């Protein structure tokens, strides 16, 4: 449930998120990042990195979407 298989799964999820996020699909990117965070139950490292390396609007949406 948390092995390398789902690790590669959400790796591909955030890869497509990066691709469509540079392409402009911010809703698709935030949905894919939600699917990526919804498998690893405590990604504090990504919780801090994506607060910094991400553009302010996309993570501003995503942080609000995380309680939902």
């Amino acid at each position: 449930k948390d092995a390398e298989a789902v690790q590669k799964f959400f790796l591909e999820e955030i890869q497509l998120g990066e691709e469509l996020l540079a392409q402009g699909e911010y809703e698709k990117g935030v949905d894919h990042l939600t699917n990526a965070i919804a498998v690893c139950g405590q990604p504090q490292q990504l919780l801090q990195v994506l607060q910094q390396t991400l553009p302010p609007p996309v993570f501003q949406m995503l942080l609000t979407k995380l309680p939902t």
Binding site: L11, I14, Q15, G17, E18, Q45, L46, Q52, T53
Partner: protein
């Protein structure tokens, strides 16, 4: 581990910051610490993820590596750009070598070294100035880049920018109190490079900034450097420097006019005559201070023409274009000197056009002088000998004749060049050993082409004796190729490369005449290569036994009459009878083969695995060694 690190490197090469936001996250501390600093070899280069990320100019991944991981920023690596491979590089050096300003700003703001050199001592400021961007150079200078730091070849920060023609960069460098009176190994003073590259703006900026108009190592001031390369604008700018006196002005005009006569890019013979005429007027403008031209011996290579002494003589060759070419050659050889590097190139070109208009006598006359000048400078003459082979073979192909002293002179030059190439190959450790070996093999092939052409001509007895003496002088050295082939081995080999340009018409290998000449001159007929094949092994291993049956017949007869063993064994322990790939060659060799009871006994010993080592006499220790 290694596979995931390679994936990290692959994603960081494309700058996939989100991929590295998981491949290097949600892990422990020391498990990824090696991964961040793991060098990954790819595309024939070695680099860390930071180095390749800065090389591809991705600021997000570099910022994440410099902020969330605190990766050390003085890592070393390799360089793919700048035409070559430079090791000992730096992340900042790779970033500044392509113009990516933001990654340079991030690296300098988070702990990189502005003066971190390379194996060639190239500071990042030198890379940024070679790229040409001005803002990055301004920022790097403002962060104390030590603008006076040179490189391994002593090319300072200003000289590379002056050569590359970035006028803003040289203007800023001279604004920040650089060294305009710089030096290098060749003696260039940052204005020789600008004049050679023909950049008027950088020359103007350096002149305005109190440059040093001083002669370099090769005996050429920047004014004479500009006149050597037909740069009229650079000559005009440097000629109003108010310290050129009067001799150097007329010398510059004479050299510029001479260079315009036979330069491939800037060929203009009206300009040549008019610049020479302006120089002669400036010489003959004073009643009592006629700056009379230096007397020159009449070189036979230029039709025995002497340099013009008065404008009355120059007015008589304003329409003699084939004489104005010779006047340009004479003037630029008098001015540049016989020992200068850039004298042989026009002499070749004026030869080459004479080779184009079926006028090969003057082509040989010019090219031999160019070859002699390049030979007595310890330069590289591998291409000029190939040009000689091509022009000789084009002479032979068109039913023309080749003078035997010309072939003798070219053969002597080729023998000297092969000697110098052997010395260079045995002396160089690892710098250009592949290039030196390729040049050596090309020189050997050129010598074989020249020997074939000499056989295809008609030579006098003394000239033939001289040619054979030069061939024997080479053969006594026993030159070898990469595979160990001697001259005879290639001369009996159908796999010997022949260049497509004007040598396939004459020099066809294997050639019976070349083989007979080499065997008569004293070639080692029993010699073997690294594979162990003899000359007989190569010639029976042939694929045209009927098409040139006369050639194969004569080569096999000559090889067996010279005294080669007909049952020698190579490294695979094969006799030339078994190596014979065609029935005709095997039949002919078997007819030529004469049996020996010594050979039969040696073959019996080799087949029976008798312990003949330290038992039979020493000479028979060699005999049985190859049956």
């Amino acid at each position: 581990m290694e596979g995931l690190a390679g994936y990290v490197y692959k994603a960081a090469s494309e700058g996939k910051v989100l991929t590295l936001a998981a491949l290097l996250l949600n892990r422990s501390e020391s498990d990824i610490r090696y991964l961040l600093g793991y060098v990954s070899q790819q595309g024939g280069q070695r680099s860390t993820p930071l180095i390749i990320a800065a090389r591809n100019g991705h600021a997000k991944v570099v910022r994440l590596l410099l902020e969330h991981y605190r990766v050390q920023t003085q890592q070393t690596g390799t360089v793919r750009f700048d035409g070559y491979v430079i090791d000992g590089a730096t992340a900042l050096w790779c970033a500044a070598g392509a113009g990516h300003f933001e990654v340079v700003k991030l690296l300098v703001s988070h702990g990189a070294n502005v003066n971190h050199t390379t194996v060639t001592n190239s500071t990042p400021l030198r890379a940024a100035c070679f790229d040409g961007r001005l803002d990055i150079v301004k920022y790097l200078v403002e962060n104390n880049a030590n603008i006076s730091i040179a490189n391994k070849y002593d090319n300072t920060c200003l000289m590379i920018a002056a050569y590359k023609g970035h006028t803003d960069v040289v203007r800023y460098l001279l604004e920040q109190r650089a060294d305009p009176n710089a030096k290098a190994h060749c003696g260039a003073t940052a204005l020789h490079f600008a004049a050679e590259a023909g950049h008027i703006d950088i020359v103007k900026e350096l002149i305005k900034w109190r440059a040093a108009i001083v002669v370099n190592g090769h005996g050429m001031t920047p004014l004479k450097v500009a006149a050597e390369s037909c740069k009229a604008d650079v000559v005009e700018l440097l000629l109003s420097h108010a310290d050129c006196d009067r001799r150097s002005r007329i010398e510059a005009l004479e050299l510029l006019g001479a260079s315009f006569a036979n330069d491939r890019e800037n060929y203009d013979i009206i300009k040549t005559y008019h610049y020479l005429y302006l120089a002669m007027l400036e010489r003959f403008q004073d009643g009592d201070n006629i700056l009379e031209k230096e007397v020159l011996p009449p070189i036979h290579a230029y039709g025995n023409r002497t340099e013009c002494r008065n404008p009355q003589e120059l007015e008589s060759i304003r329409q003699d274009r084939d004489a104005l070419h010779m006047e340009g050659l004479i003037v630029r050889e008098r001015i540049l000197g016989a020992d200068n590097i850039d004298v042989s190139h026009p002499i070749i070109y004026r030869g080459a056009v004479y080779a184009d208009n079926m006028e090969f006598e003057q082509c040989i006359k010019l090219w031999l002088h160019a070859l002699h000048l390049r030979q007595k400078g310890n330069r590289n003459t591998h291409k000029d000998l190939l040009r000689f082979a091509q022009v000789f073979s084009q002479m032979i192909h068109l039913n023309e004749t080749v003078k035997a002293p010309d072939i003798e002179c070219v053969l002597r030059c080729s023998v000297l060049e092969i000697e110098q190439s052997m010395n260079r190959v045995k002396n160089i450790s690892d710098a250009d050993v592949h290039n030196a070996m390729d040049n050596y093999e090309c020189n050997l092939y050129t010598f074989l082409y020249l020997v074939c052409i000499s056989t295809k001509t008609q030579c006098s007895e003394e000239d033939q004796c001289k040619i054979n003496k030069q061939i024997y002088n080479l053969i006594h050295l026993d030159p070898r190729t990469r595979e160990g082939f001697t001259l005879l081995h290639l001369a009996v080999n159908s796999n010997t490369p022949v260049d497509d340009f004007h040598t396939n018409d004459v020099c066809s290998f294997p050639n019976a005449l070349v083989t007979k000449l080499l065997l008569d001159c004293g070639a080692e007929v029993n010699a073997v290569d690294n594979e162990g094949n003899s000359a007989l092994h190569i010639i029976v291993q042939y694929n045209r036994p009927i098409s040139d049956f006369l050639t194969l017949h004569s080569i096999i007869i000559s090889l067996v009459e010279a005294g080669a063993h007909t049952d020698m064994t190579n490294k695979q322990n094969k006799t030339p009878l078994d190596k014979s790939t065609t029935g005709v060659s095997e039949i002919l060799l078997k007819t030529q083969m004469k049996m020996s009871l010594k050979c039969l006994a040696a073959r019996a010993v080799r087949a029976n695995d008798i312990n003949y080592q330290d038992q039979i006499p020493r000479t028979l220790e060699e005999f049985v060694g190859f049956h």
